[PDB]
RNA sequence: AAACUUUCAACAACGGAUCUCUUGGUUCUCGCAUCGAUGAAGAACGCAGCGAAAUGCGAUACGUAAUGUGAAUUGCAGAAUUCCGUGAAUCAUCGAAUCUUUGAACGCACAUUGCGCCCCUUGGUAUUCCAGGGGGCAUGCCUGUUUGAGCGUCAUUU
RNA sequence: CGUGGAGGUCAGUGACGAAGCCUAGACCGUAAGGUCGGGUCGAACGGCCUCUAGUGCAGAUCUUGGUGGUAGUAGCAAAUAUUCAAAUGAGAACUUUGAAGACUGAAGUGGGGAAAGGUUCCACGUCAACAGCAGUUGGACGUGGGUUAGUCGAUCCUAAGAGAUGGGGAAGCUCCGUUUCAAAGGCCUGAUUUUAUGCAGGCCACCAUCGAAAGGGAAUCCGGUUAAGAUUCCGGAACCUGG
RNA sequence: GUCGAAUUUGGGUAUAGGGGCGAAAGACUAAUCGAACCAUCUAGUAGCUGGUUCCUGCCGAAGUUUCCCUCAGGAUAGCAG
RNA sequence: AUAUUGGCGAGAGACCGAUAGCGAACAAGUACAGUGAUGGAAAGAUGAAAAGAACUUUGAAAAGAGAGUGAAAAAGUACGU
RNA sequence: UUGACCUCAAAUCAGGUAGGAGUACCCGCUGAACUUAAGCAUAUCAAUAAGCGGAGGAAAAGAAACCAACCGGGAUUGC
């Protein structure tokens, strides 16, 4: 068993870990397969910008305060401030949270 | 077994038809790899088991 | 080199598609390619053909029957005689052959122009 | 004698041909085929036996319907007749 | 003697033969051959004989 | 993973004057009573069967990877290293070799090959088309049947059709300045390659 | 309660799982109500259920079912989703109100063992993912 | 060469029925003389003729049955196209495409518009 | 000294190793979503001029109908000339049919190729007997229709 | 040092001939091994700089296959049995026929069957294989023929028992019971003259199905006839059931 | 030894795995049973036997300390590269 | 957006090369064993093309010796080396 | 006596649907032991394998009775 001067390793390989092993040989193959999905979307989505526009919103918690990230939607106060109604942003391609 | 049943007899009639060697023409066919009847069945060495 | 993603370059499939293939190839002579503007045509049972490669080089004849099991044709006159007195035809592969006279009824009358020919 | 002299006292039949699979596994007294199950409404196939399942799955028979299903979908399940193109 | 169909019975034998060969049947005796076929003995009445009937259809 | 283990065998133990390896059951087939499971047997599993999660690809430092490629680029110069891999350029005015950028806008292979032979790369082209031998290994019928030598390589800044004008002639390979594959600049881990530069590509190198 | 079907009380195991009479089953009697009713009439689809009455020996429920092969439900596209084949035997897979509660799928840190499926979350978190490039 | 395919298509219904017994009898004759000599390859070329005439009867007979049910619903099951079991079940294109009153009012009022960025 | 034993070489035997080939297996990757009461998966039995087996098929039986290609199949026999043309092909495609007895098995049964019932029609001097031919009779459940049952119970003349 | 494969190189070797194998022939290395000559043989292979691993053999009562000495040995010794002549055949202690001598001694070494076997039954031709000797002989080989039912049985009834409904359990595959908490059925008279079969009364209530080719059971025998069939076929003579 | 009976036996049926059945012997349960056969977990674990596949060059030991339900085993120190 | 040794259709490899690789490169879930659940192999390469041996002789034949075919039967079907 | 309501039924009433197969992925139920603990009873193996019910090309989850306490974020799913 253990002996000499080594750290006390705890390896969680006691179960039948071999029957569930998700190897990732595809990776690059899936990368091309997702370029195809992105490329074909750009055609049938009409000459549209694809991704919507997301708000500039401050990050939560203590450590993540110096940086500002992208949110999910422009609430309703900003939507009403812009003048356009709530459901018109979705048609024009603006996400609303 | 003398007092037989048609289900059994229909199987034996199938066995009689298939209890034959190869006709000679088979061996002369193009790209033939067959030389013997590997499914040969006899009443002494093996039993059908119906 | 191969560019499409639909044709194989593997030997196993390439040979498999050759031997285990259904029924459904000789070129033409210099005069025919200077008269019909076509290089190759399928072989038929009523074609005059001249041998260019092999031991029996130069002996011309007519195909007696295209035998698609051996993947070779049998020229009527080009044959070898057995010891006992009979004679059997020798298989000839159409790629080593040259057709000089055709047999065109309506279809070979049509295959010529589809392949950029001008017929007669 | 528990050996050779007792092997000549056996002339009866315990199992018989199964009307559903013909493997001679239809127990007479039990009236239940031991290979597939009959007249049960389901064919018995246990995951602890894998060779037995491999002997009776799809592909060991003729596939009188499924050899054409791939072909039928291969075009789109058309119906009707065909047209005349040329020649 | 004919190689009759397996599904047929002496009721369907006594009528099919008399419609093709226009001869009545005294009785029919039928056995199953051990080769997978069925055999049938058709005895016509005394008003006819099988000799000129067997050859007229071709077999004799 | 199921190879060799499909056969259900049990050890016969001791007392029967045979090896106590697992013997399969049943009878009347010639396989019954034979060995199984162990790698010493016939038809059993191989010792520690190879499994899919071996380390196939190995990571390399990005800076180190650029270092060897930069070293390989220096190996394209210096005449002595070039001749160490064949590369019959003994008759060449100077190394490196610089050609006009019009070679990029060549469309016909016949004119493309003639352009290389005019410079002096004919011997390198002539080195190929003579070494087309078979493969000694059993992989010659594993879609690796034929092998050749490596001819000159062409480096171009902007593609104008040269890639299709040289992709058919054996030995000649084309690569942009951006890619500059190390597998092409030093095959077999041997320094020195007869790389053909162009005016546009040689200026973009710096 | 759910008494084990073990014969004569024998469990044939460690002295840990030696109890037979004091196991409580893992689904509510409401789920069994849907199962025994959704199986008698296979031409229907189970929508929901609710408690109506009870006594010392039984628990009574009344199950509401929909017919997707009826032309009324085939039209009136408010309820077209019950006609989709993916909703075949919803209660058998625990997709009803009691099903989503018996297996405990809900939002919150109080549900982390079962938040996207107890088995799927286990397999997702108990597995070795090996990339091409071992970092 | 037995019989041809399209020549007997123009034949009447009664004439095709009498064509079977013409073929059916000569089969009974070919069996009688087949045993006489061990060669008779002509039986195959016309046993494929009895099948062709039988097939043409059904295609002509099914057409009359089909024409009777045109216009009305509830045609015989085998006349209905096979598809698969799943495709025959589920929702028709009308049933699937149907939408409720409220959602439709939203759709015409607020469709999804197309746009891009130029400046 | 022979016979005999042993070693080597030459040749010849038993034997199948070694080298080289594979109309195979294994793994990875890129796409698709198509079983079954319109009765499937599977099983039995039969079908080719001469075949047992594989393969295909279902007394329309190595299969019929349709389209395309276009002058064959082959071991032999035989059939051809249908081959300058709605025509060959153990061809390809396949959108129309046949699809035996079974099988979730569907009239009841089934280690007995057993026993039933209903409709149409034909024959047997026949609605009631028999036979032939054609078509039907499984269970749970949904909607609707039609017949009912219940001093559960409501109005109405008695 | 060597083995299977991968990158580069020697424009490396090669059907006027590669690889492989044999060779008390030669050379080099202490050795792992390498090189050459000869014979055999016909499609690929080698040196070097590196990479990779399912990489080395005498035995693990090691796996598979094959062959030895033993060895031409042990043995082919129970059931009281053989001999002569002819025929056939290249080839007779064994085949056939004839003549003797015996045995089973009719609780057969005889005639028929049940279960089981499945064409072993019979005919023609035939000996490479099996008949632990042999064999022109065969229950073997190749090709064919043969099983005829109103009366014989299965079909039908039920025994011990199995088991489907209505129901009650069980997450469930299914378990209990099978007449028990189920409103569970057809049936003769009459109506007739669209009533086809409905309708108006008399009615009875049994209450799935399976389960014993020696349990119960409607009815036939004789003569003769095949290479192989018969209470089945031919002839003659019967009886039962339904109408 | 017994032999017309708590006799012998055919066919159908019922009882099945820690379960059946036992005029009991831990007997029988289809050559296996004081505890059936088959498949899976399973390549079950072993401080215990056996084997563990090329050359040469250089160096080259131990059966001793302490602890352990430890004395046909480990850890620590030692010897060694 | 995620998984997918099952089904169909494809492209590949520093994989295995037929005592290996799937059990099966072959009439392979095949022969065969077991009353049963189940177990389950062996088997590739004559030659380019059968041209696979006319005919003479010996023998009863099987076959041998010639001849002949074929580059070569030291390639003759119990057939690469 | 007639005509409505509610409940329960009958038919080879009109029209429909469900059973089985495959399970590689997916949704649940039920559910061990070998083994590790250099003994063994919690534990680990394992909320696994076997057994059962259920679907699709994906299944599931999915627009918070959420995470956070931060200048708060904001359906679900996967790395």
Swiss-Prot record, chain C:
What are the GO MF terms of this UniProt record? RNA binding; structural constituent of ribosome
Record's Gene Ontology CC terms? Answer: cytosol; cytosolic large ribosomal subunit
Transmembrane segments annotated in the record for this chain: none
Annotated localization: Cytoplasm
Chief localization: cytoplasm
Q: Which Gene3D superfamilies match?
A: 2.30.30.30
Which SUPFAM superfamilies has this protein been placed in?
Translation proteins SH3-like domain
Q: Which GO terms describe its biological process?
A: cytoplasmic translation; ribosomal large subunit biogenesis
Q: InterPro entries of this UniProt entry?
A: KOW, Rib_uL2_dom2, Ribosomal_uL24_CS, Ribosomal_uL24_euk/arc, Ribosomal_uL24_KOW, Translation_prot_SH3-like_sf
Q: Does the keyword Cytoplasm apply?
A: yes
Anything else known: There are 2 genes for uL24 in yeast.
Name the family. Answer: Belongs to the universal ribosomal protein uL24 family.
Please describe what this protein does: Component of the ribosome, a large ribonucleoprotein complex responsible for the synthesis of proteins in the cell. The small ribosomal subunit (SSU) binds messenger RNAs (mRNAs) and translates the encoded message by selecting cognate aminoacyl-transfer RNA (tRNA) molecules. The large subunit (LSU) contains the ribosomal catalytic site termed the peptidyl transferase center (PTC), which catalyzes the formation of peptide bonds, thereby polymerizing the amino acids delivered by tRNAs into a polypeptide chain.
Q: Output this protein's name.
A: Large ribosomal subunit protein uL24A
Q: Which species is the source of this protein? A: Saccharomyces cerevisiae (strain ATCC 204508 / S288c) (Baker's yeast)
Swiss-Prot record, chain D:
**Keyword Zinc-finger in record:** yes
What does the entry give for GO biological process? cleavage in ITS2 between 5.8S rRNA and LSU-rRNA of tricistronic rRNA transcript (SSU-rRNA, 5.8S rRNA, LSU-rRNA); cytoplasmic translation
NCBIfam families in the record: PRK04179.1
Its main localization is cytoplasm
What is the official name of this protein in its record?
Large ribosomal subunit protein eL37A
Please state the gene responsible for encoding this protein: RPL37A
Mind naming one GO cellular-component term on file for this protein?
cytosolic large ribosomal subunit
- What species does this protein belong to? Saccharomyces cerevisiae (strain ATCC 204508 / S288c) (Baker's yeast)
UniProt-annotated location(s): Cytoplasm
Family (UniProt) = Belongs to the eukaryotic ribosomal protein eL37 family.
Q: Print the keywords alphabetically.
A: Cytoplasm, Metal-binding, Ribonucleoprotein, Ribosomal protein, RNA-binding, rRNA-binding, Zinc, Zinc-finger
Q: Where does Zn(2+) bind?
A: 18, 21, 33, 36
Sections of the chain in a coiled coil: none
From Swiss-Prot, chain E:
Single GO cellular component annotation? preribosome, large subunit precursor
Q: Name one GO molecular function term.
A: RNA binding
Q: Where are the transmembrane segments?
A: none
Q: Provide the alphabetized UniProt keywords.
A: Cytoplasm, Isopeptide bond, Ribonucleoprotein, Ribosomal protein, RNA-binding, rRNA-binding, Ubl conjugation
Any single GO BP term: cytoplasmic translation
* Predominant location: cytoplasm
Question: Where found?
Answer: Cytoplasm
Quote the function comment for this protein. Answer: Component of the ribosome, a large ribonucleoprotein complex responsible for the synthesis of proteins in the cell. The small ribosomal subunit (SSU) binds messenger RNAs (mRNAs) and translates the encoded message by selecting cognate aminoacyl-transfer RNA (tRNA) molecules. The large subunit (LSU) contains the ribosomal catalytic site termed the peptidyl transferase center (PTC), which catalyzes the formation of peptide bonds, thereby polymerizing the amino acids delivered by tRNAs into a polypeptide chain.
Q: How does it assemble?
A: Component of the large ribosomal subunit (LSU). Mature yeast ribosomes consist of a small (40S) and a large (60S) subunit. The 40S small subunit contains 1 molecule of ribosomal RNA (18S rRNA) and 33 different proteins (encoded by 57 genes). The large 60S subunit contains 3 rRNA molecules (25S, 5.8S and 5S rRNA) and 46 different proteins (encoded by 81 genes). uL23 is associated with the polypeptide exit tunnel.
- Please state which protein family the record places this protein in: Belongs to the universal ribosomal protein uL23 family.
Q: What is this protein called?
A: Large ribosomal subunit protein uL23
Q: Which residues of the full protein are shown?
A: 83 to 142 of 142
Curated annotation (Swiss-Prot), chain F:
A biological process (GO) annotation for this entry?
Answer: cytoplasmic translation
Q: Where in the cell is it found?
A: Cytoplasm; Nucleus
**Modification sites for Omega-N-methylarginine:** 42
Positions of disulphide bridges? none
Where is it found, in Gene Ontology cellular component terms? cytosol; cytosolic large ribosomal subunit; nucleus
Keywords, ordered alphabetically: Acetylation, Cytoplasm, Methylation, Nucleus, Ribonucleoprotein, Ribosomal protein, RNA-binding
Entry PTM:
N-terminally acetylated by acetyltransferase NatA.
**Does the keyword section mention Ribonucleoprotein?**
yes
**Its Gene Ontology molecular function terms?**
RNA binding; structural constituent of ribosome
User: What does the comment on domains in this protein's record state?
Assistant: The eukaryote-specific C-terminal extension harbors a nuclear import signal and delivers the ACL4-uL4/RPL4 complex to the pre-ribosome, triggering uL4 release from ACL4 and incorporation into the 60S ribosomal subunit.
According to its UniProt entry, what is the function of this protein?
A: Component of the ribosome, a large ribonucleoprotein complex responsible for the synthesis of proteins in the cell. The small ribosomal subunit (SSU) binds messenger RNAs (mRNAs) and translates the encoded message by selecting cognate aminoacyl-transfer RNA (tRNA) molecules. The large subunit (LSU) contains the ribosomal catalytic site termed the peptidyl transferase center (PTC), which catalyzes the formation of peptide bonds, thereby polymerizing the amino acids delivered by tRNAs into a polypeptide chain.
The UniProt entry's sequence similarity note says:
Belongs to the universal ribosomal protein uL4 family.
> What remark does the entry add?
There are 2 genes for uL4 in yeast.
What is the protein named? Large ribosomal subunit protein uL4A
Q: What organism is the protein native to?
A: Saccharomyces cerevisiae (strain ATCC 204508 / S288c)
Interval of the full protein contained in this chain: 54 to 259 of 362
């Amino acid at each position: 068993a253990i002996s000499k001067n080594l750290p006390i390793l705890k390896n969680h390989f006691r179960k039948h870990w071999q029957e569930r092993v998700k190897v990732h040989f595809d990776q690059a193959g899936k990368k091309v397969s997702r370029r195809n999905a992105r490329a074909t979307r750009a055609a049938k989505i009409a000459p549209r910008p694809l991704d919507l526009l997301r708000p500039v919103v401050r990050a939560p918690t203590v450590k993540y305060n110096r940086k500002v990230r992208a949110g999910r939607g422009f609430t309703l106060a900003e939507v009403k401030a812009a003048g356009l109604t709530a459901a018109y942003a979705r048609t024009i391609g603006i996400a609303v949270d | 077994a003398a007092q037989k049943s048609f289900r059994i007899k229909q199987k034996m009639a199938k066995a009689k038809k298939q209890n034959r060697p190869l006709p000679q023409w088979i061996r002369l066919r193009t790209n033939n790899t067959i030389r013997y009847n590997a499914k040969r069945r006899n009443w002494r060495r093996t039993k059908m088991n119906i | 080199a191969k560019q499409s993603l639909d044709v194989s370059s593997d030997r196993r499939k390439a040979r498999k598609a050759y031997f285990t293939a259904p029924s459904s190839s000789a070129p033409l002579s210099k005069e025919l390619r200077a008269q019909y503007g076509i290089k190759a045509l399928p072989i038929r049972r009523d074609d005059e053909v001249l041998v260019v490669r092999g031991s029996k080089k130069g002996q011309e004849g007519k195909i007696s029957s295209v035998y698609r099991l051996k993947f070779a044709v049998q020229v009527d006159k080009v044959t070898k005689e057995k010891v006992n007195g009979a004679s059997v035809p020798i298989n000839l592969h159409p790629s080593k052959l040259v057709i000089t006279k055709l047999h065109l009824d309506k279809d070979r009358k049509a295959l010529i122009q589809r392949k950029g020919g001008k017929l007669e | 004698g528990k050996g050779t002299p007792s092997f000549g006292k056996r002339h009866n039949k315990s199992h018989t041909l199964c009307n559903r699979c013909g493997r001679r596994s239809f127990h007479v007294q039990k009236k239940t085929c031991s290979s597939c199950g009959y007249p049960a409404a389901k064919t018995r196939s246990y995951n602890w036996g894998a060779k037995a399942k491999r002997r009776h799955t799809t592909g060991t028979g003729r596939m009188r319907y499924l050899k054409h299903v791939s072909r039928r979908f291969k075009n789109g399940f058309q119906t009707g007749s065909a047209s005349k193109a040329s020649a | 003697v004919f190689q009759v169909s397996m599904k047929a019975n002496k009721y369907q034998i006594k009528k099919a033969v008399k419609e093709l060969y226009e001869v009545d049947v005294l009785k029919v005796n039928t056995l199953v051959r051990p080769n997978g076929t069925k055999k049938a003995y058709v005895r016509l009445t005394a008003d006819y004989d099988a000799l000129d009937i067997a050859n007229r259809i071709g077999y004799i | 993973e199921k190879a060799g283990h499909q056969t259900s065998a049990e050890s016969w133990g001791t007392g029967r004057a045979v090896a106590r390896i697992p013997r399969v059951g049943g009878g009347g087939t010639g396989r019954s009573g034979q060995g199984a499971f162990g790698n010493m047997c016939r038809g059993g599993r191989m010792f520690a069967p190879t499994k899919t999660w071996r380390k196939w690809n190995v990571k390399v430092n990005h800076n180190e990877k650029r270092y060897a490629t930069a070293s390989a680029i220096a190996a394209t110069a210096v005449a002595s290293l070039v001749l160490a891999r064949g590369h019959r350029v003994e008759k060449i005015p100077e190394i490196p070799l610089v050609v006009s950028t019009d070679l990029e806008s060549i469309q016909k292979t016949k004119e493309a090959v003639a352009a290389l032979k005019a410079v002096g790369a004919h011997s390198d082209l002539l080195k190929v088309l003579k070494s087309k031998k078979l493969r000694a290994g059993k992989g010659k019928y594993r879609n690796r049947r034929w092998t050749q030598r490596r001819g000159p390589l062409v480096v171009y800044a902007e593609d104008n059709g040269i890639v299709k004008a040289l992709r058919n002639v054996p030995g000649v390979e084309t690569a942009n300045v951006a890619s500059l594959n190390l597998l092409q600049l030093a095959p077999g881990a041997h320094l020195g390659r007869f790389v053909i530069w162009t005016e546009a590509a040689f200026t973009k190198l710096d | 309660n759910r008494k084990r079907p073990v014969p004569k009380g024998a469990t044939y195991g460690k002295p840990t799982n030696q109890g037979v009479n004091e196991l409580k089953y893992q689904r509510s009697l409401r789920a069994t109500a849907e199962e025994r009713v959704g199986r008698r009439a296979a031409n229907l689809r189970v929508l929901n259920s609710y408690w109506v009455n009870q006594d010392s020996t039984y628990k009574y429920f009344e199950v509401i079912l929909v017919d997707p092969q009826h032309k009324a439900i085939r039209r009136d596209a408010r309820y077209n989703w019950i006609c989709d084949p993916v909703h075949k035997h919803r209660e058998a897979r625990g997709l009803t109100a009691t099903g989503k509660k018996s297996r405990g799928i809900n939002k919150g840190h109080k549900f982390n063992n079962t938040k996207a499926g107890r088995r799927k979350t286990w397999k997702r978190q108990n597995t070795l993912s090996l990339w091409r490039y071992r970092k | 060469a037995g019989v041809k395919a399209y020549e007997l298509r123009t034949k009447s219904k009664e004439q095709l029925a009498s064509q079977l017994v013409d073929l059916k009898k000569e089969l009974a004759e070919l069996k009688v003389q087949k045993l006489s000599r061990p060669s008779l390859p002509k039986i195959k070329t016309v046993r494929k003729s009895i099948a062709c005439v039988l097939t043409v009867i059904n295609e002509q007979q099914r057409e009359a049955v089909r024409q009777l049910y045109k216009g009305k619903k509830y045609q015989p099951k085998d006349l209905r196209a096979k598809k698969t079991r799943a495709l025959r079940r589920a929702l028709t294109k009308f049933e699937a495409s149907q939408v409720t009153e409220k959602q439709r009012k939203k759709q015409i009022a607020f469709p999804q518009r197309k746009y891009a960025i130029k400046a």
